[PDB]
Amino acid sequence: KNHTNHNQNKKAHRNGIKRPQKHRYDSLKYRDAKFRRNQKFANRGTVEAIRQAK
Amino acid sequence: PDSKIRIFDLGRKRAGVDEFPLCIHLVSNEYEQITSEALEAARICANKYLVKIGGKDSFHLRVRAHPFHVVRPNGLVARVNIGQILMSVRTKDSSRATAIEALRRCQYKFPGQQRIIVSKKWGFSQYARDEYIEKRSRGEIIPDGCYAKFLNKRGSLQEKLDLFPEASFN
């Protein structure tokens, strides 16, 4: 037999169709470049202003 | 491929709707197939018997199974459901026995099981005998060749008026 999809769904579910782990922070890299640039500057000022307030 | 059966209406196909009130159906009792050669052989048998007994002016015969399904090209067959009408004969009330026997003999030309049913509807129309009488009585039925036109509440008024003068528009 050249092709069949008989036992494949069983093999999938034995270890389950597992989901990727959920993370609070996803890469701001791999996003829009203009947004990434400004968010770097916005983040940099935010952490400094938190530090100054502290 | 060309179908063996070519004629599908025999007898007085121009007969009026009021002239032949009785309708008798040869109905398939099984989910099966019918070949075109089978249909024409039964057609010939039905026409030959009916013209011999009551003459060509005593009946209107309509074969309703059309060989449209191709079998794998070599020929054509008619795929039939359960309860689908195969043959229909409309005559007077007197020719009931003749039409029943004619369909009984034509059963032997068809594969599988068929039942002969005397339809309670008036002729080939969809209206039962009682409602056909009463609608014709109050005036919404007008004969038109081999069929009849029925008054419907839709459409304009003047056109329905001058086509149907006896109709009582309440």
């Binding site: 093999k11 999938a12 579910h13 270890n15 389950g16 169709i17 597992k18 989901r19 990727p20 996803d26 996003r31 829009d32 | 159906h25 109905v27 309860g83 009408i85 049913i117 339809s119 309670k120 509807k121």
Partner: protein, 158 residues
Amino acid sequence: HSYGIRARTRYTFQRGFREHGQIRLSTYLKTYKVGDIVDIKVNGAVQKGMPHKYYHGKTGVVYNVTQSSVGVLIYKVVGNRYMEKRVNVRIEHVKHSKCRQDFLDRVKANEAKRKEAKAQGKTVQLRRQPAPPAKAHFVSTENNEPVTLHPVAYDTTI
């Protein structure tokens, strides 16, 4: 087989009957933010930015917003895992999920009931409950006398 991008898309990318012509403009007048849950319904008239036929009818969360398109993240079953698929889909092929809006409306209502319960000093059960079995009730027979029925005899209608 042929394995093109739009193979076997005759009925799914076809525009609806008497729905052909020009795309309505409320599509462009809509705003999408990252985190928005949106449905994908490929509009066949706009060929640019069309996601693959797998994503038609798939719902995901917006992760990126550009001038003319939206980044939608969808979990696609590949063998034995869901893999994160980030399709750049034009806004014509996108619509807001009414389920999310229904959820947000329900959240606003729940907060409202909680505030009124706290103000009144009462406790309000905010969980939805499935349809329970019917309550006991009386059925009146006055002017509704039962009609005894029998199965009808078999007859040949045609």
